[PDB]
Amino acid sequence: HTTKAQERTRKRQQPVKLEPLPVLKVYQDHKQPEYIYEQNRQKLMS
Amino acid sequence: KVYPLSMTWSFGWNSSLPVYYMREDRRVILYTCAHTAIMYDVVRNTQYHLQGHPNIISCLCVSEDRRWIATADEGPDCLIIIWDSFTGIPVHTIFDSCPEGNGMRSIAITRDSKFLATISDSATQKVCIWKWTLAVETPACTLELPKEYGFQDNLVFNPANNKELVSNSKTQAIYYCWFEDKGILAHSAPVLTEKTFNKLVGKFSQSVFHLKLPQVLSATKEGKLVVWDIHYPSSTSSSAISAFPFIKPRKLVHLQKEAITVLMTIDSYIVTGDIKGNIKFYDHTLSVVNWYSNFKLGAIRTLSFSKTIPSLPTEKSNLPTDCTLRGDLFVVRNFIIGTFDATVYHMTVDGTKLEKLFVEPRDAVYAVSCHPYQPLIAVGSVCGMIKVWDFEKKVYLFSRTFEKGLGVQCLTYNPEGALLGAGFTEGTVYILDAMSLENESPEPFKYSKSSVSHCCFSHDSNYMATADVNFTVAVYMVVVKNGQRVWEYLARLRSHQNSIQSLLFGVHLDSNEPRLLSLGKDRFLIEYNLVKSCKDHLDVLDVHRTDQGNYPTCMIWYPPLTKELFLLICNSGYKVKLFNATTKMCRKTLLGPAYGSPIEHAQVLPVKSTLELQKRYLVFINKDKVGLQILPVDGNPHKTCAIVCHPNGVAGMALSYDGRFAFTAGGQDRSVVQWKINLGALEAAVSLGGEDLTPFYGLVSGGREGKFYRELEDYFYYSQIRSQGIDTMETRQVSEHICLSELPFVMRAIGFYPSEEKIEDMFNEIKFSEYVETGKLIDKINLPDFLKVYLNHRPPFGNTMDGIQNSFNVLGYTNSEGKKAIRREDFLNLLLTKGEHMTEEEMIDCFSTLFGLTPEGWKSEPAATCINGPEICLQKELPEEITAEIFTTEILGLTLSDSSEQLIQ
Amino acid sequence: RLPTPSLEMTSYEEGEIEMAVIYLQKLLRGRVVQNMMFEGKEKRLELILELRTSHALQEDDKLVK
């Protein structure tokens, strides 16, 4: 309605807490099909 | 069962709308008058009425027995409406007959009385048949036709049939037959050409079913009649398509040099009437029976014949010589005649008198003036006519025909009633004798050179003034000589930069002396010092600008209700304002009547006595409606009513000096109507609104509990804190009031956006309004009155796109997408330089706030790290082309959805 | 003789342009100020609510309070 500036304050208020266990995140990305095709691309570059 | 604004009169009718004859013995005849259809009895001298339509009445036909009357109206939403003569308060209707169809432009009813059949106005026209004896509300059968035939605007039923109709345009004629067992309606519209006779044939007007033969007649402007024969499926065809009956143009004959356009057939005579005053009766052979001709009568557009079949005296009688070899007795029914020029007559069947009835304005109509002490009202046309009535007697009385081809529109009485005055569209002004309508001045005054637009007298008979459509003023004065009064010119001056919207005289009782006052569309108001004015020098000494974003429309004296005195003015904002008899400064903001369009003109009902001094009432017209208001005004809807009249436009006002009655003149409807009023019905309606805030609460959505209303109330407190200051160590304190500097803040906080000028106006309104009683300035305002201010000042709905679009449309170029658009730096520079000026740093702060680059609220903690960012943001935030779409996306998260009305009184 | 001089507004179109500009200026100033007030009302809303708890505005005081 008329409430824009509040977004900025909230946006900075948004918390910062990290990926709780990074190994999991890494392993998930390694299963990503796009990453697997990137590894295939790296095989093509050789 | 009772109403505030009832109608019962008609003056005038459109001669193109054909009359019929109903009840003969008493003489009662039928005519259409704008959206209304009317019966009038000559000898009782009383009107009977059929009540309205959504549009102007387009076409009508009466049953042969004159028991039944059918009618249609043009425009959208049209209704086909049918009526019993002798109940006189009948009803019958076809709803919703056509969605798009612009009303039925010709329509016939069966003399057989079973069926009704109609032609729609539409780009391709419809043909439909209707079993009106049943409560049918949908077409029984339908066809739509090529445009090539053209406007089709004559239709007739066949007395020898139930399943045959004829219609023609100017330029094509059509035969119809309906096969109900097949459920099929079939048409043919063959094309005539010179080849059929090697002769001129040209344009034709009306077509009709012959008396006795398988034939169709068509009458021509060419002086000729055309006749067709019909051919019906030959037996060998019956096994196949059985091509629906075909029409063949057997015959053409020339009957006179002069143009014919009327054709109707009575009891085995044919009857034909001419552009130039000759009406003829024929036997089915087209044999010649004695005619009627050469009276002061012409272009006879209405023929009709009596319901009464004539009884037959012969012992003494007056019958004309028929032209048979012997030449026999001849006794028609009685029959009705009427011209092009709106002249209505009845004939004694025995010919012994051609008797004329009311006689009425030819063409277009302009508004009427009342005598201030006598039950007299004067009517005038554009053309050649001004005439006066006694509106109690309903009697046509004194009238003078005016010089040929002068257009005339303006009319006035002087305040005594002893004088009448009229204004003529060709640079011409007359003063008139309120008796004889003698040209009082030996010649008229013809100083200007285009149309008048107002005229008025001063309180002094010696002075009169007119406006002209060139935005030029002129004044008129009496000079005393030799014991005589004579009228003389006084000098012109051009004082308004736009169309003049009102002109008024004023009194200095302070000096028993005359004043002249003018309202322009240029938002400017002026007074002229008559007493200092002199030849070639209307003395102009006072200009005010009186409206903003808008323009005024009407100016009148406000009635005395107060120590102070006021003029009343109305504007396209649906606002009304009061301005001060000395200073002409403003202090009143009002919401005009909600009814559809802004007010065009208002007039005030006369005073007899203290009883009127105790109770005053204001009459007004808009584009299309007439309405009443009780004083004082406050924008309460229950306080006002309006009603619809001549709904292609209304154009002036007049009031019976007894305070009982009002009269409205239309324009192209050629019609003037009297209106009869009940005030107590409005007092009852007022009671429906209750009292105190109740109406105004009702105007707020959710009244006393709506989330809007609570949201507003918070701002009263928040702004009270602002007035205290947010930082204080004391107890907080608040009570009832805000201090006026906060009022613009609160008003913006709710969602309405007064200009600086509006702010000044409202501060004036609050300070001065109490002033004269108290003697005091006052600056503590209470919520209830603040609410009244908001409700009057606000846009008459939610805020609207329209002014934004108009502003871009004036300012911007049409872009690559054609959208009205402004280049960013140009837009910024204009916003600083023009309108009301802005400081650059102010504008930058505003933009930074709107984009949300600053910390919020701007009212407790500092900022100055921000402002350098906005310098580049001016490029980075604003696009290079800006549009209403972008700007409204920036300003508005509110989707300001459209309002609605229909329930509102 | 000639018609009199005019008394002049240089053009009605200048009135159109300036009023359009005023329309934009009005909508900008209004939006800015309303945003200020609504924002402030948020922070103060607790204060405002307690104030309303104590005492009320004249209309809703007179009935409701």
Side-chain angles (χ1 to χ4, degrees), chain B residues 59 104-108 118-127 143-156 165-176 187-189 204-207:
Chain B
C59 186
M104 313 317 155
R105 213 167 62 217
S106 188
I107 164 172
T118 61
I119 292 148
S120 72
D121 185 298
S122 46
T124 47
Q125 301 192 245
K126 300 173 180 288
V127 182
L143 176 61
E144 303 188 346
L145 302 180
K147 299 203 180 176
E148 303 194 340
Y149 311 159
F151 283 175
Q152 220 51 235
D153 297 332
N154 163 70
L155 168 58
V156 171
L165 291 103
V166 61
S167 81
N168 67 285
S169 79
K170 275 186 172 181
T171 52
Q172 182 55 297
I174 312 191
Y175 169 92
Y176 306 83
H187 89 290
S188 185
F204 44 79
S205 65
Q206 187 150 37
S207 301

Side-chain angles (χ1 to χ4, degrees), chain B residues 830-840 842, chain C residues 25 29:
Chain B
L830 287 163
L831 283 165
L832 303 190
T833 49
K834 296 196 180 185
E836 180 58 285
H837 195 282
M838 309 181 69
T839 289
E840 182 169 25
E842 160 204 345
Chain C
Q25 288 167 334
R29 286 183 167 160

Side-chain angles (χ1 to χ4, degrees), chain A residues 7-46:
Chain A
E7 87 191 328
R8 181 61 162 281
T9 75
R10 290 176 189 163
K11 192 170 182 177
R12 293 196 301 99
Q13 290 302 328
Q14 294 166 5
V16 300
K17 193 164 172 71
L18 301 185
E19 284 284 13
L21 62 183
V23 162
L24 183 185
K25 215 304 188 182
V26 175
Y27 201 66
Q28 194 70 4
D29 294 349
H30 282 63
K31 282 202 179 75
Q32 293 282 61
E34 295 184 34
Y35 179 76
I36 293 161
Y37 296 127
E38 205 65 72
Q39 301 314 111
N40 182 265
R41 260 89 70 164
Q42 290 145 70
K43 306 185 180 184
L44 303 178
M45 289 147 55
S46 192

Side-chain angles (χ1 to χ4, degrees), chain B residues 703-736:
Chain B
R704 180 163 36 222
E705 289 80 17
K707 292 176 184 177
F708 168 86
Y709 182 61
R710 204 171 303 292
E711 175 73 6
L712 181 151
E713 198 206 283
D714 298 338
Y715 289 108
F716 201 101
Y717 274 21
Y718 177 88
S719 62
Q720 253 267 10
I721 285 73
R722 291 204 44 53
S723 76
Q724 181 60 98
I726 321 190
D727 295 350
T728 223
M729 324 306 288
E730 301 93 320
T731 54
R732 319 317 287 238
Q733 57 76 29
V734 176
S735 54
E736 303 182 302

Side-chain angles (χ1 to χ4, degrees), chain B residues 709 713-714 749 753 836, chain C residues 25 31 34 41 52 55 60:
Chain B
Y709 182 61
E713 198 206 283
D714 298 338
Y753 311 113
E836 180 58 285
Chain C
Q25 288 167 334
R31 178 55 48 248
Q34 182 164 30
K41 204 210 87 158
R52 178 175 290 118
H55 81 79
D60 293 89

Side-chain angles (χ1 to χ4, degrees), chain B residues 353-615:
Chain B
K353 190 175 185 182
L354 171 58
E355 187 157 61
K356 88 181 191 181
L357 290 78
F358 55 83
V359 183
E360 292 291 23
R362 213 195 83 164
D363 297 14
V365 157
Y366 288 116
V368 304
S369 201
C370 298
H371 190 298
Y373 294 108
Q374 301 177 352
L376 309 179
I377 190 171
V379 184
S381 181
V382 295
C383 174
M385 175 168 287
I386 295 196
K387 58 171 175 171
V388 182
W389 295 77
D390 169 336
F391 54 74
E392 283 287 15
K393 293 187 184 90
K394 316 303 185 202
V395 163
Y396 163 68
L397 53 89
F398 187 69
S399 58
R400 187 187 71 154
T401 306
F402 290 5
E403 303 181 43
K404 293 184 183 181
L406 288 176
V408 207
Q409 167 168 353
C410 210
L411 215 181
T412 192
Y413 265 97
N414 85 307
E416 189 163 331
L419 315 175
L420 198 82
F424 303 66
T425 59
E426 312 320 300
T428 288
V429 179
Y430 283 66
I431 296 173
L432 318 166
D433 158 18
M435 316 320 136
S436 69
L437 307 175
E438 158 177 337
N439 175 36
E440 266 285 1
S441 57
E443 291 178 47
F445 303 105
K446 296 191 176 176
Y447 212 97
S448 190
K449 305 182 184 177
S450 74
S451 187
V452 65
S453 52
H454 298 286
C455 68
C456 57
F457 276 93
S458 107
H459 72 288
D460 178 10
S461 313
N462 298 315
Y463 283 94
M464 202 188 80
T466 65
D468 75 35
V469 300
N470 298 8
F471 322 160
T472 302
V473 176
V475 195
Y476 303 104
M477 71 182 293
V478 167
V479 182
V480 175
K481 313 179 195 177
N482 323 326
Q484 291 288 357
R485 276 180 153 138
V486 169
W487 278 100
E488 300 190 358
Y489 166 86
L490 174 62
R492 71 189 287 201
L493 186 140
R494 199 161 186 269
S495 61
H496 284 291
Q497 314 314 101
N498 206 322
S499 189
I500 293 169
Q501 307 290 253
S502 286
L503 185 72
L504 173 61
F505 266 99
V507 193
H508 291 298
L509 219 183
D510 308 346
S511 60
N512 204 2
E513 260 174 357
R515 310 167 68 174
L516 185 71
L517 307 94
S518 67
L519 183 77
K521 191 168 185 175
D522 56 8
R523 288 166 278 285
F524 282 19
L525 188 80
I526 295 185
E527 177 179 40
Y528 315 89
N529 187 327
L530 295 177
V531 188
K532 284 188 174 184
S533 302
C534 51
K535 297 190 178 184
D536 301 337
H537 185 77
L538 182 68
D539 195 28
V540 195
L541 82 176
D542 186 18
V543 187
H544 296 259
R545 181 178 174 147
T546 60
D547 201 19
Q548 196 76 330
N550 294 278
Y551 54 87
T553 61
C554 183
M555 158 187 64
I556 63 168
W557 289 101
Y558 199 66
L561 292 176
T562 47
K563 299 183 189 185
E564 298 171 285
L565 287 174
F566 303 95
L567 302 182
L568 176 141
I569 294 179
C570 313
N571 92 333
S572 52
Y574 296 73
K575 310 305 182 177
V576 183
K577 308 184 194 180
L578 297 189
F579 294 90
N580 167 274
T582 299
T583 68
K584 321 184 181 66
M585 299 194 290
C586 175
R587 45 173 166 277
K588 201 68 173 176
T589 311
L590 302 167
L591 168 68
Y595 305 112
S597 106
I599 286 175
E600 279 289 324
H601 184 53
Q603 297 188 354
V604 205
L605 285 157
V607 170
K608 321 176 188 179
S609 69
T610 53
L611 311 179
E612 294 78 38
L613 306 186
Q614 295 149 20
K615 285 196 177 189

